[PDB]
Design an enzyme around this catalytic site. Structure first.
Site, PDB file in Angstrom:
ATOM      1  N   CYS A 280      22.017 -53.680  19.977  1.00  0.00           N
ATOM      2  CA  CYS A 280      23.262 -52.574  20.522  1.00  0.00           C
ATOM      3  C   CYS A 280      24.708 -52.737  20.749  1.00  0.00           C
ATOM      4  CB  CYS A 280      22.384 -52.201  21.490  1.00  0.00           C
ATOM      5  SG  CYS A 280      20.912 -52.068  21.720  1.00  0.00           S
TER       6      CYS A 280
ATOM      7  N   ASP B  14      30.074 -26.010  14.659  1.00  0.00           N
ATOM      8  CA  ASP B  14      28.434 -24.834  15.200  1.00  0.00           C
ATOM      9  C   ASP B  14      27.718 -24.951  15.428  1.00  0.00           C
ATOM     10  OD1 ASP B  14      26.687 -25.239  12.934  1.00  0.00           O
ATOM     11  OD2 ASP B  14      29.269 -24.828  11.608  1.00  0.00           O
TER      12      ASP B  14
END
Lengths: 221, 221
Positions: free
Chosen positions: B44, B137
């Site tokens: 990570c 969008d």
């Protein structure tokens, strides 16, 4: 559609090599079920082009490739000729992996594969550029969901197969951008004592502001 | 969890930079929301560090990044000092993008980010390495689902981002393993007449067994 750890549905479909059941086809090998919008289209040709070239590279690791589209098995065979041609081989209607018939969208709908924009000539939607990687246990191990406008990276597909197999076999994990052969990370759970004992090749810890000892590399076991 | 086309849920999240509503954070830019299984763990760290090193390349293309795990925003702040150290930058708790706190697994279950093979000390399962790409969008344009064990490839994320943006402004489509700058495929339902007019840089078609005119290359518009 599908999520991590889910078992592959043992579907039946017609393919360029006959009707089959999924688990039977997969048998005891990893599997890559990938989808492409439409036969006789440019990107899908480069993709399956590439995938056929990479087939031995996948077979060597006990991975079975199988494609899928909303076209007919007839269409598949006709296009395979175009495929074999595109990448400069003899134009048979054969490939190193089956293509699945899904005109009626049973598999598309179920697996969650549908491209939002892309449609056939009757306005009915087609699949996107999906990849599912199934372990031999039939569980989903990794997936990718790309639009029809954007072709995939097959090298990356190969890379992650390689990582999935390593990390299945060895108590490590591959860092961002990891290339085959590179150092890997030691799992955060394995204590210092057991880590030396488990990785003779060397275990290197990077000292951090929090002074925690999680950031540990080791050569590819 | 989420299919192509689906609208990003306008959720509320507590992050390293405060409480936010998703859509307002995005505004009218492309969004990359991505999850990692746990703070203070090795893969990570490599990932967010690399992410933080790329943040200029995403921002110069109107893409906001937003990370996320189950760890506390208190954790995230601490571990950013390690992220920053790892990058060899001053170890502040500042990062070029925020990190969501999903202590409760609320967005995890929502977007289907739950991992099958990884849990915390308290038993509860954690997120896997998922990436969602949202357009201005708010629609899923692309997503990927990597397991705990396999670091992602962030150069591929940037690459598909380039493609998503290109193919959305130009009527082309990128082939397998397309590098930014490489030539692109002409959309197959464009008429040769209209295509010659659309791509002055030239259209180049490879005759194939089928005699079909779909395999047309053009230099990147």
């Amino acid at each position: 559609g599908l999520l991590l750890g889910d078992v592959a549905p043992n579907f039946e479909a017609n393919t360029t090599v006959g009707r089959i059941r999924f688990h039977d086809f997969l048998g005891d090998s990893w599997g890559i079920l990938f989808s492409h919008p439409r036969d006789f289209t440019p990107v899908c040709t480069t993709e399956l082009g590439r995938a056929a070239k990479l087939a031995p590279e996948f077979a060597k690791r006990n991975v079975k490739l199988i494609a899928l589209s909303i076209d007919s098995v007839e269409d598949h065979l006709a296009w395979s000729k175009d495929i074999n041609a595109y990448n400069c081989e003899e134009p048979t209607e054969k490939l190193p992996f089956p293509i699945i018939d899904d005109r009626n969208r049973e598999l598309a709908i179920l697996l969650g594969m549908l491209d939002p924009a892309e449609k056939d000539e009757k306005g009915m939607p087609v699949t996107a550029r999906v990849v599912f990687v199934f372990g031999p246990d039939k569980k989903l191990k990794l997936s990718i969901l790309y639009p029809a406008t954007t072709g995939r990276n097959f090298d990356e597909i190969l890379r992650v197969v390689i990582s999935l197999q390593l990390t299945a076999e060895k108590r490590v994990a591959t860092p961002v951008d990891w290339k085959d052969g590179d150092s890997v990370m030691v799992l955060p759970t394995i204590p210092e004592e057991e880590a030396k004992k488990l990785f003779p090749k060397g275990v290197f810890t990077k000292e951090l502001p929090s002074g925690k000892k999680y950031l540990r590399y080791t050569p590819q076991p």
